[PDB]
């Protein structure tokens, strides 16, 4: 699959040799071409993976993630080129380089065939993101946000490295195929309990689990728009991919281990969905929405049923798209009014109608309206949980009610009512913003047309 990896490494010097006023055009065009190329990975087999070489492979869980990454890069390029207009050409090329390196690391991450290479790229993704946040953020809290983001990740991921090298020393290999075919049960031991914790906690922190989720509001609120897009769309799904890969070795230990994580995920689902009801900041509301959805994905991965895994894959894809669109929609208003307070700019449907319908469709997909892929994934997870325990429906049911509540609350607060009288600098929506919204939203509907492409290997 070097036919996708090498064009990105070629995006690098093409950007660094493009003339000063053609960087955005070249980057967008060739990133769109690269996404078109990567779209060919969706032709998956039904029994085994696509083993390209000794180091790279692809199944139907990683192909939609790769397509999502390659599609997200041009969207971030379009969203970034507005707030970087006054920026010097060299640092604009540096920003584009950061985005390209992030894409390359993500692309190699989803297809690395042994656990150590996956770990190396999984953690290499931290450097471009940190540089983006702490160099191109706007406020003074970006430094502390970057510190939280870095150290939460590393604290949970270093024990993963120790566990991985221990596992290879004991079993002889870390290639995923060999690990799956030669898998053996884990005994009920303290050593095994701590090896389970070391294997699981890094991905819990990345999801994030409700407990260790504090870094996420700081990182997503202080980041520039492209940073927020990549954090919400792809970087949260690294933990889900890692769990769905590493879990095969962990069983049968997971049955008595997953209890605290399941309880944390469900109750924190309720808690973080309730937090969105009293959020005075829009970006923080979207961030806590992401936390609750990813808690649902954690429950799905933990209970380990085929329907669970299909729902988790669908929910990961759907949430990536929806959260990216919501962040872009919020950033449009932010660039209008230079403040993130929700109640500052009100009644925007009167002044920005098409942007108002973009808001409506984003909010509708956020609260899992049928037959969107959001609800497909959520309902599959809910059915799997009901099979796991019939009492889960109460918690699941409560979450659905609060999710619809804060989604429509955000829509009503920002779009309806009467426009604030003092603000007179609300210009008509640009073609760039409307195109960006359309390019987020059209793939969601086209995907609900053909939903088997994002349902994972268990399909």
């Amino acid at each position: 699959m070097l036919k996708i990896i090498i064009p990105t490494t070629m995006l690098l010097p093409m950007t660094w040799m493009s003339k000063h006023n053609m960087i955005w055009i070249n980057a967008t065009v060739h990133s769109l071409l690269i996404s078109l190329i990567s779209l060919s990975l969706l032709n998956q087999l039904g029994e085994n993976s696509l083993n390209f070489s000794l180091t790279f492979f692809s199944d139907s869980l990683s192909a939609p993630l790769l397509v999502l990454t390659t599609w997200l890069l041009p969207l971030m390029l379009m969203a970034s080129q507005s707030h970087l207009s006054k920026e010097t050409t060299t640092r604009k090329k540096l920003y584009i380089t950061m985005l390209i390196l992030l894409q390359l690391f993500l692309i190699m991450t989803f297809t690395a065939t042994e656990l150590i290479l996956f770990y190396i790229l999984f953690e290499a993704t931290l450097v471009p993101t940190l540089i983006i946040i702490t160099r191109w953020g706007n406020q003074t809290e970006r430094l502390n946000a970057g510190l939280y983001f870095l150290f939460y990740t590393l604290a949970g991921s270093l024990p993963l490295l120790v566990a991985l090298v221990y596992i290879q020393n004991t079993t002889g290999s870390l290639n995923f195929l060999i690990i799956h075919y030669w898998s053996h049960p884990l005994s009920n031991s303290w050593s095994n309990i701590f090896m389970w914790l070391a294997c699981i906690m890094a991905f819990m922190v990345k999801m994030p689990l409700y407990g260790l989720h504090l870094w996420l509001p700081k990182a997503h609120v202080e980041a520039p728009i492209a940073g927020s897009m990549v954090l919400a769309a792809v970087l949260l799904k690294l933990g889900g991919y890692g769990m769905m890969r590493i879990t095969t070795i962990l069983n049968p230990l997971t049955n008595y281990m997953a209890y605290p994580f399941l309880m944390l995920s469900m109750w924190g689902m309720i808690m973080t969905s309730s937090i969105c009801l009293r959020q005075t900041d829009l970006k923080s509301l979207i961030a806590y929405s992401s936390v609750s959805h990813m808690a649902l994905v954690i429950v799905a991965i933990m209970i380990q049923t085929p329907w669970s895994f299909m729902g988790a894959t669908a929910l990961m894809i759907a949430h990536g798209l929806t959260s990216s669109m919501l962040f872009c929609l919020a950033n449009t208003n932010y660039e209008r009014v230079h403040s993130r307070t929700m109640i500052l700019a009100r009644g925007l449907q009167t002044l920005l109608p098409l942007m108002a319908t973009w808001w409506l469709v984003a909010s509708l997909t956020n609260l899992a309206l049928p037959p969107s892929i959001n609800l497909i994934g959520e309902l599959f997870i809910i059915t799997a949980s009901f099979s796991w325990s019939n009492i889960t429906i109460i918690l699941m049911g409560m979450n659905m009610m609060i999710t619809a509540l804060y989604s429509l609350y955000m829509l009503i607060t920002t779009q309806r009512g009467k426009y604030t009288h003092h603000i007179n600098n609300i210009k008509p929506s640009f073609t760039r913003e409307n195109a960006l919204m359309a390019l987020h939203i059209l793939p969601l509907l086209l995907l609900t047309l053909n939903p088997k492409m994002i349902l994972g290997p268990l399909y």
Partner: protein, 121 residues
């Protein structure tokens, strides 16, 4: 430690005579290409630090950087391959000379081995 003392080893050779019975790394070896890339990056950083046009300032010195890195990398790769070949040779010889420590166990089929089943529910 482990490889420091070995019989019949010249102290500062860096490339024993027995290493010539191994296939040399190809000149298009990806590791050599990475060494050349490292040389190119060193040349570019040299241009940037000295406040010169990064891509085009000194072509002769950039070429010297690239060829120096490739030249060192070729012998580095040869020595790497030789040491790994020695490791495998010694391990195989030790396995062969100590049969009782590496015995071939009986082959069992999955129809005979009884693995406990853990239901997922």
């Amino acid at each position: 430690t482990m490889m420091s003392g070995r019989p019949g080893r010249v102290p500062l050779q860096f490339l024993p005579n027995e290493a010539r019975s191994l296939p040399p790394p190809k000149l298009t070896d990806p590791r050599l290409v990475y060494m050349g890339f490292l040389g190119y990056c060193s040349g570019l950083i040299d241009n940037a630090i000295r406040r010169r046009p990064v891509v085009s300032a000194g072509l002769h010195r950039q070429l010297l950087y690239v060829t120096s890195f490739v030249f060192f990398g070729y012998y580095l790769l040869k020595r790497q391959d030789y040491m790994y070949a020695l490791r495998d040779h010694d391990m195989f010889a030790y396995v062969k000379s100590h049969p009782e420590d590496f015995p071939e166990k009986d082959k069992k089929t999955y129809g005979e081995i009884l693995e406990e089943f853990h239901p997922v529910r």
